[PDB]
Design a protein around this ligand. Structure first.
Ligand SMILES: O=c1[nH]c(=O)c2[nH]c(=O)[nH]c2[nH]1
Length: 467
């Protein structure tokens, strides 16, 4: 009842928006190119050379990651006072402001306005990604924590699916309709602002500092459906006492701490290889990638729709596959399969003209890549980061992981069109090399984590440290 409604509202408000903004920049790409060309011509009187337009488009696409970086940097400070529901309402404010900033760009004729709107969407996505789990896991009972853990990925996948769906030439792909593609963002924000504020707040955050026992008891009774919640309250108080009994280490000392040097190196490498493995690229430039694959230009958006559908289905299947396969074998197999399928994709791209049916193997390779990602290392690191460290919720580790992820996303988004221009026929070899290198490194480094207490991994890494 209340728990399901709250989880659905929060997911549709944050992860749905993140998925939509991850997979909305590909469909209207030629129209935005034409608008950029016309605007530059009218302002300056000279045409755009293709390289300059490609650089501008890359900046427009990749500024979202810099927005996410600044959002992750600011959320740590904002959450000490704002909280969870207030932070989500501020997130809704950012979302509506950026949506209105983007959707009213063509009318005034401003591309800088579009850039700033995409930047504010980046900060919105960063705040959403850093806030939503801390609320979803908090308001959920420990019995059903895994379900709401996988919901935060199911909803990103469904947002990517609906972003692919919105952009077909019939629905929202016409010349005189592409401005509304960024105006759809209003509806999720409106529904979230209508649903969430009529729900109980996060109990632990208020029970930390303001110490409101009555409201916490009411929220726990509403969530659990019973008036006897003494055990959970006692456990929360014990956890808070344990947390305040131990000093919290910052980023500088964590980087300067030799006893977690290998841990931070491993998490940094895992995040960098996860983001340079390439899925945000295969969302951003799906139309161009499938056009370069020999598929006729009259069927690409339907191919993108199928891509989104198979992504969602792979997420749904992974939701159960994860619980039986494992963590380290699963992640290594995911990276190895991604590398092998990148090899398959590049060999069917290089020699597509040999047989007429070869260009239709690119979509099969794309589905294989997406299945290997979303049924694999796609969601493991979000639990692996907690598994590695002692507190399992270390702010320094979270900040480092977020910074690495956002910088890697920015680099990939900025450099993918350039590597395509350089290696039209073999541009996926770089991704394959990155995937295989990451697989080798994390097979030689990362040990088994599931069904292993923090003491065992701590002593294993202590003997690994050679000290
Ligand atoms: O579950 C995910 N799906 C994605 O499409 C994606 N893209 C990304 O960077 N991280 C994730 N995670």
């Amino acid at each position: 009842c209340s728990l399901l409604v709250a989880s659905l509202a929060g997911a549709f408000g944050s992860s749905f928006l993140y998925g939509y903004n991850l997979s909305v920049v590909n469909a209207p790409t030629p129209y935005i190119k034409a608008f950029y060309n016309e605007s530059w011509e009218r302002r300056h009187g000279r045409p755009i050379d293709p390289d300059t337009l490609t650089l501008l488009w890359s900046v427009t696409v990749s500024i979202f990651a810099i927005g996410g970086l600044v959002g992750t940097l600011i959320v740590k400070m904002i959450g000490k006072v704002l909280g969870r529901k207030h932070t989500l309402l501020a997130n809704n404010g950012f979302a509506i402001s950026a949506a209105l900033l983007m959707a009213c760009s063509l009318q005034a004729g401003a591309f800088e306005m579009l850039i700033v709107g995409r930047f504010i969407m980046g900060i919105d996505g960063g705040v959403a990604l850093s806030v939503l789990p801390m609320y979803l896991s908090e308001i959920s009972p420990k019995e059903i924590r895994g379900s709401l853990g996988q919901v935060t990925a199911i909803f990103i996948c469904i947002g990517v699916f609906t972003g692919q769906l919105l952009g077909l030439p019939e629905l929202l792909g016409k010349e005189s309709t592409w401005p509304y593609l960024f105006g759809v963002i209003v509806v999720p924000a409106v529904v979230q602002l209508l649903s969430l504020p009529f729900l109980p707040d996060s109990p632990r955050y208020l029970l930390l500092e303001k110490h409101n026992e009555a409201r916490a008891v009411k929220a726990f009774q509403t969530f659990l459906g019973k008036a006897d919640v003494s055990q959970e309250v006692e456990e929360v108080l014990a956890e808070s006492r344990v947390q305040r009994s131990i000093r919290l280490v910052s980023v500088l000392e964590l980087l300067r701490a030799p006893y977690v040097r290998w841990q931070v190196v491993t998490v940094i490498v895992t995040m960098a290889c996860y983001q340079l493995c390439g899925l945000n690229a295969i969302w951003f430039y799906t139309n161009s990638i499938f056009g370069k694959a020999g598929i006729p230009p009259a069927k690409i958006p339907y191919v993108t729709l199928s891509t989104g559908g198979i992504e969602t289905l792979a997420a749904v299947f992974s939701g159960l596959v994860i619980e039986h396969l494992g963590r380290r074998p699963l992640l290594i197999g995911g990276f190895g399969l991604m590398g092998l399928f990148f090899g398959t994709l590049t060999i069917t791209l290089t020699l597509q003209d040999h047989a007429p049916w070869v260009p239709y193997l690119s979509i099969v390779g794309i589905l294989a890549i997406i299945a290997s990602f979303c049924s694999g290392p796609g969601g493991i690191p979000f639990i692996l980061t907690g598994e590695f460290f002692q507190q399992s919720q270390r702010p320094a580790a979270f900040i480092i992981a977020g910074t690495v992820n956002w910088l890697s996303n920015f680099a990939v988004g900025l450099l993918f069109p350039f590597i395509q221009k350089s290696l039209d026929t073999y541009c996926f070899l770089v991704f394959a090399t990155i995937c295989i290198t990451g697989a080798i490194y994390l097979y030689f480094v990362l040990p088994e984590t599931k069904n292993r207490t923090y003491a065992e991994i701590s002593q294993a890494f202590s003997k690994r440290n050679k000290a």
